[PDB]
Amino acid sequence: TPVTLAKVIKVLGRTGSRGGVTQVRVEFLEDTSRTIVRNVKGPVRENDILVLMESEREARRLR
Amino acid sequence: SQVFGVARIYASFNDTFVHVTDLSGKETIARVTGGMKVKADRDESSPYAAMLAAQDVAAKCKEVGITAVHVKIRATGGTRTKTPGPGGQAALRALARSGLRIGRIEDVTPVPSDSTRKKGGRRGRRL
Amino acid sequence: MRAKWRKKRTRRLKRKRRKVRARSK
Amino acid sequence: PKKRASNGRNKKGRGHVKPVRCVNCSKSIPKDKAIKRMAIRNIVEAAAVRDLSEASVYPEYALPKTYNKLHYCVSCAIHARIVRVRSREDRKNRAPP
Amino acid sequence: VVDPFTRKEWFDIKAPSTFENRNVGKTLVNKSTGLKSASDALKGRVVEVCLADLQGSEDHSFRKIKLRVDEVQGKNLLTNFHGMDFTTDKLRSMVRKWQTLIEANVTVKTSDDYVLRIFAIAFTRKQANQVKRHSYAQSSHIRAIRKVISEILTKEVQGSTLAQLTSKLIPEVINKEIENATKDIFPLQNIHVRKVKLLKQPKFDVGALMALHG
RNA sequence: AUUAUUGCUCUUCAACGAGGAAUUCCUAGUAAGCGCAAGUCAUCAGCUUGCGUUGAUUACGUCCCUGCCCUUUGUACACACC
RNA sequence: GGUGAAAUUCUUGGAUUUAUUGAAGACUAACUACUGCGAAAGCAUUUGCCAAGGACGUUUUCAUUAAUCAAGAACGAAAGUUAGGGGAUCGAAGAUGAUCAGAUACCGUCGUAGUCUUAACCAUAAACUAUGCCGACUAGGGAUCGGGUGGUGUUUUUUUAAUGACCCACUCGGCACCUUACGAGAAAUCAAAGUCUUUGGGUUCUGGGGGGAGUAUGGUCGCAAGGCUGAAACUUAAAGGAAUUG
Ligand SMILES: [Mg+2]
Ligand SMILES: [Mg+2]
Ligand SMILES: [Mg+2]
Ligand SMILES: [Mg+2]
Ligand SMILES: [Mg+2]
Ligand SMILES: [Mg+2]
Ligand SMILES: [Mg+2]
Ligand SMILES: [Mg+2]
Ligand SMILES: [Mg+2]
Ligand SMILES: [Mg+2]
Ligand SMILES: [Mg+2]
Ligand SMILES: [Mg+2]
Ligand SMILES: [Mg+2]
Ligand SMILES: [Mg+2]
Ligand SMILES: [Mg+2]
Ligand SMILES: [Mg+2]
Ligand SMILES: [Mg+2]
Ligand SMILES: [Mg+2]
Ligand SMILES: [Mg+2]
Ligand SMILES: [Zn+2]
């Protein structure tokens, strides 16, 4: 299993009609110099660490 | 590189057609539609169906001989809506992601130098 | 009533008096 | 009273244009009074483009969009598409965005 | 308890001469049984492949081609010219607002006596210092361009068959002679032979057909 | 005091094995659990009004549902969409 | 297949999808626009023919020949009517599947007339700019369509030109938009709806509270349907317009 660590670098806001969902840009630690935006399920602030279960794939909007 | 045929995805609403044929057209090879792989009429065109039908159509396409195929996506046409149906894109997505190649695809929606009076009369379909 | 159908009301209405009068020509 | 100077829509020095049929309900409507959008969009879509090139031959291919002009009937234009309703004044503004 | 696939005869498609790959694709028939054979039955089919799918290069993305199958020989069937189409997307792109369109056509014969009808489309261009936002010709302009186009189109045909005409169409010689005679009249951009259909072939002549093959 | 005011003792020992579609209330000394005093009251609290005691889990967001505001806009309504 | 969802419906007659051809009639997509022309209705494929037209240019010609018009006449969307042809499509009537308390409908199916064309009718549309025509005057702005004039303007190369397309200024005459408002209006708005109690350039037509009523009658036109002309008795205190706040 290829674990993938990413540090939250900015809090962008709440998608999801409901709104339990937060848009976030992260910096993966093992070799930085690249970034990807993810969608969270729980409450999140800056400098948190998310376990991307598959490194390369991102979303945008939610309904 | 491969062996080639035609895809031709007719995608109207209330149903989505996928069927591959010989690059000459004259000879088929496996069809199946969206109305097949679910039963509810209402859902006869939905992307979830056309997937499952793009799945059953990819299967035979490779289980006979075609390794690859160009597509000719098509809407109702004529004096009708002319716009892409719902389960066309789902169909395309499902057949490339299946295990089949893609090459040079165009639209074949019949467009008229307009006429033959549209249906539903001058006052429109009103409800 | 719609003016259009009131005009039709009396179009007919005249056609009947046009008719009933003929019986007596 | 009156509500627009362009009356219904755009027709000055002509007296008769010629009807189109509504793309949504098929209602006839004079072509000048129509309301129109070029429905320029991609053949594939958002997600498909990766999975497109991925399982295809050629280098990145080319990619050729579809183009079809859309004709709405006011009500149909109002019921969904371009419409809202504007203030007495915003109405006057012909600028698109 | 059948599955015609466990029955169908199979076949590959070979292309004519003046292009790139003569090898094209595959097909299915039915085993040439006594009474209804694989041969005389179909074959006569046609195939549409983009010539950029058949010339290799991509400066030919549009321009589709109709090949018709005339003869057959032991898992090897040739094909010949049957038409030329354009892609729907290309036109739809060429045809933009704010400018005048122009179309004209003619029916005409060739050496090896195939009759055909070729098409031609051209749009008016703004010219690189114009201020007015549109650029329209003058009808009197449009009538001129057509007649000249027509004057040019008729000449380009009845050269040595579609054979040379095909050899003529591919490098779009026609396109620029149009471009040439025209600029004495009006600007114009795009300009292509767009379409050409077939409607009166001569006689089989198994000889002449066999001249593109080797 | 029977149609049994309430209280005690013995005996009798039910349904209920966490509850379908649905639906209520709630963000910190709060929820929930726990009992008290007060009102009523001759006698009777499974009710209420307050009270303190033990003391969490989870949001700190949104417009999806529902509810209401606000513009815009239509009105031939003004006893005003009953 | 068709829909919000369905059903009527079509399917060993391989339906729906595919391919190659063919026939029939209609139509003119995209280019199409605050763009063109016509008296108005109206008019968008090509090419040949037939006559016609405005604008412009004009140190040509004639010389008051003109403006507007009761009577009268030409043309006149759609439908409708007569007689042929045509009859693809869509489709008043009718019949249906559903919906509904009902559902003679909306939505779906079948589909007669019709839709197209010739010969003849009919003469009506919110036939709209709800705004007569001719002439004068009154105020700014950038676009544009046609014509013309001016330039040691651009771009086209060949050898400079000549052309053509383009650019800038101007000028007639078009279709419109913009901002202003001296001015007008009950207002909304209006470069006319302005130059009106400081009330007169020329001319045509219509209206005089509302209903009764475009009804009765007579005349007249029409195959008809109906067109044109067109009252009264009686009833009645409002009906109506533009703007405001709810
Ligand atoms: Mg509605
Ligand atoms: Mg009698
Ligand atoms: Mg109104
Ligand atoms: Mg009109
Ligand atoms: Mg007590
Ligand atoms: Mg109580
Ligand atoms: Mg109001
Ligand atoms: Mg055209
Ligand atoms: Mg007289
Ligand atoms: Mg008269
Ligand atoms: Mg018919
Ligand atoms: Mg009925
Ligand atoms: Mg019924
Ligand atoms: Mg009925
Ligand atoms: Mg009238
Ligand atoms: Mg109007
Ligand atoms: Mg001015
Ligand atoms: Mg009173
Ligand atoms: Mg009002
Ligand atoms: Zn509509």
Q: Which residues of E are less than 8 Å from B65 in CB distance?
A: 10, 26
Let me know how long chain D is: 97
Distance CA E100, CA B65 (A): 49
Q: With CB atoms and an 8 Å threshold, state whether B89 touches D44.
A: yes
Give the residue before each break in chain E, using a C-to-N cut-off of over 2.5 angstroms; say none if it is continuous.
none
Distance CA E188, CA A41 (A): 58
Helix, strand, coil share (%) of chain D residues, nearest 5: 20, 15, 65
The yes-or-no reply on C/B contact (3 CB pairs or more, < 8 Å) is no
SS3 category, B114 = coil
Q: With CB atoms and an 8 Å threshold, state whether D25 touches B120.
A: yes
Residues B73/D55, Cβ–Cβ less than 8 Å: no
Residues B18/B31, Cβ–Cβ less than 8 Å: yes
Q: Flag whether residue B122 sits within 8 Å of chain D, measured between CB atoms.
A: yes
Residues 119-148 of E with CB under 8 A from B: none
Distance CA C1, CA B105 (A): 59
Ligand 17 center from residue D13 Cα (angstroms): 19
Distance CA E196, CA E165 (A): 11
CA atoms within 13 A on the CB side of E88: 17
Ligand 20 center from residue D94 Cα (angstroms): 22
Secondary structure (DSSP) of E13-50: EE--SSSS-SEEEEEE-----SSS-TTTSS---EEEEE
Distance CA E6, CA B90 (A): 31
Distance in angstroms, CA of D77 to C1' of G75? 39
> In which residue are the tokens 């032979």 written?
E193
Residues E29/E38, Cβ–Cβ less than 8 Å: yes
Structure tokens at E146: 């057509």
Q: What's the CA dihedral at D20, D24, D27, D29 to 10 degrees?
A: -40
Burial of D92 (0-12, 13-18, 19+ CB in 10 A): exposed
User: Taking the mean position of all CA atoms in its chain, how far away is CA E69?
Assistant: 16
Query: Computed over its alpha carbons, how large is the radius of gyration of chain E?
Result: 21
The yes-or-no reply on D/B contact (3 CB pairs or more, < 8 Å) is yes
Secondary structure (DSSP) of E99-132: S-EEE--EEEE-SS--EEEE--EEEPPP-TT--S
The protein residue nearest G42 (Cα–C1') is: D16
Residues B20/B61, Cβ–Cβ less than 8 Å: yes
- Report helix angle B89-96 to B47-64, nearest 10: 40
- From residue E182, alpha-carbon distances to B63, E31, E153, E179, E190 in Å are 55, 56, 13, 5, 13
Distance CA E40, CA B109 (A): 33
Distance CA D11, CA D32 (A): 7
Q: Flag whether residue E73 sits within 8 Å of chain D, measured between CB atoms.
A: no
Helices (H), strands (E): how many in chain E? 6, 11
Q: With CB atoms and an 8 Å threshold, state whether B22 touches E88.
A: no
Measuring from the CA of residue A19 to each C1' atom, give the nucleotide at the shortest distance. F62
Q: How far apart are the first and last CA of chain A?
A: 31
Pair type for strands B68-69 and B101-102:
parallel
Q: Which residue of B has its CA nearest to D46?
A: B89
CA–CA min distance E18, chain D (Å): 23
Q: Flag whether residue D59 sits within 8 Å of chain B, measured between CB atoms.
A: no
User: Taking the mean position of all CA atoms in its chain, how far away is CA B80?
Assistant: 16
User: Taking the mean position of all CA atoms in its chain, how far away is CA A6?
Assistant: 7
Distance CA B87, CA B73 (A): 11
> In which residue are the tokens 């990145």 written?
D60
Cβ atoms < 10 Å from Cβ of E214: 6
Domain residue ranges of chain D, discontinuous segments joined by +:
1-97
Burial of B90 (0-12, 13-18, 19+ CB in 10 A): buried
Burial of B118 (0-12, 13-18, 19+ CB in 10 A): buried
Where would I find the beta strands (DSSP E) of chain A?
4-15, 21-28, 36-40, 49-52
Which stretch of DSSP H or E encloses residue E155? helix E140-156
Cβ atoms < 10 Å from Cβ of E12: 13
Residues B16/B33, Cβ–Cβ less than 8 Å: yes
Burial of C15 (0-12, 13-18, 19+ CB in 10 A): exposed
Q: Which nucleotides of F are covered by protein (CB under 7 A)?
A: 59-64, 72-74
Distance CA E174, CA E185 (A): 17
Per-residue buried b or exposed e for B29-38, using 16+ beta carbons within 10 Å of the residue's own CB? bbebbbbbbb
- Mutation site for B-interface testing, chosen from D42, D56, D63 by largest number of B Cβ within 10 Å: D56
Distance CA E118, CA E159 (A): 14
Residues B70/D62, Cβ–Cβ less than 8 Å: no
Which stretch of DSSP H or E encloses residue C12? helix C3-22
Pair type for strands D28-30 and D19-21:
antiparallel
Q: With CB atoms and an 8 Å threshold, state whether E90 touches D62.
A: no
Distance in angstroms, CA of E105 to C1' of G145? 30
Dihedral angle sign, alpha carbons of residues B77, B81, B87, B91:
positive
Task: Judge if the beta carbon of E21 is closer than 7 A to nucleic acid strand G.
Answer: no
Of the bound ligands, which one is closest to the alpha carbon of residue B113?
8
Dihedral angle sign, alpha carbons of residues E158, E159, E165, E169:
negative
Q: Which residues of E are less than 8 Å from D68 in CB distance?
A: 92
Q: Flag whether residue E95 sits within 8 Å of chain B, measured between CB atoms.
A: no
Burial of B119 (0-12, 13-18, 19+ CB in 10 A): exposed
Closest CA to D22 of D75, D72, D81: D72
Per-residue buried b or exposed e for E36-74, using 16+ beta carbons within 10 Å of the residue's own CB? eebeeebbebebbbbbbbbbeeeeebbbbbbbbbbbbee
Secondary structure (DSSP) of B9-38: EEEETTEEEE-EEETTSSSEE---BTTTS-
Distance CA E20, CA E124 (A): 34
Distance CA E177, CA D77 (A): 47
Q: Flag whether residue B103 sits within 8 Å of chain E, measured between CB atoms.
A: yes
The residues facing E103 across adjacent strands are E121
Closest CA to E83 of E61, E105, E104, E68: E68
Backbone angles phi, psi at D17, to 5 degrees: -95, -140
> In which residue are the tokens 């362009």 written?
D6
Distance CA B9, CA B28 (A): 13
Backbone angles phi, psi at E150, to 5 degrees: -55, -45
Residues A38/A50, Cβ–Cβ less than 8 Å: yes
Burial of D58 (0-12, 13-18, 19+ CB in 10 A): middle
SS3 category, B118 = coil
Q: Flag whether residue E90 sits within 8 Å of chain D, measured between CB atoms.
A: yes
Residues D26/D79, Cβ–Cβ less than 8 Å: no
Residues D7/D74, Cβ–Cβ less than 8 Å: no
Closest CA to E11 of E54, E74, E68: E74
Query: Computed over its alpha carbons, how large is the radius of gyration of chain B?
Result: 16
Ligand 4 center from residue D8 Cα (angstroms): 13
Residues B22/B122, Cβ–Cβ less than 8 Å: no
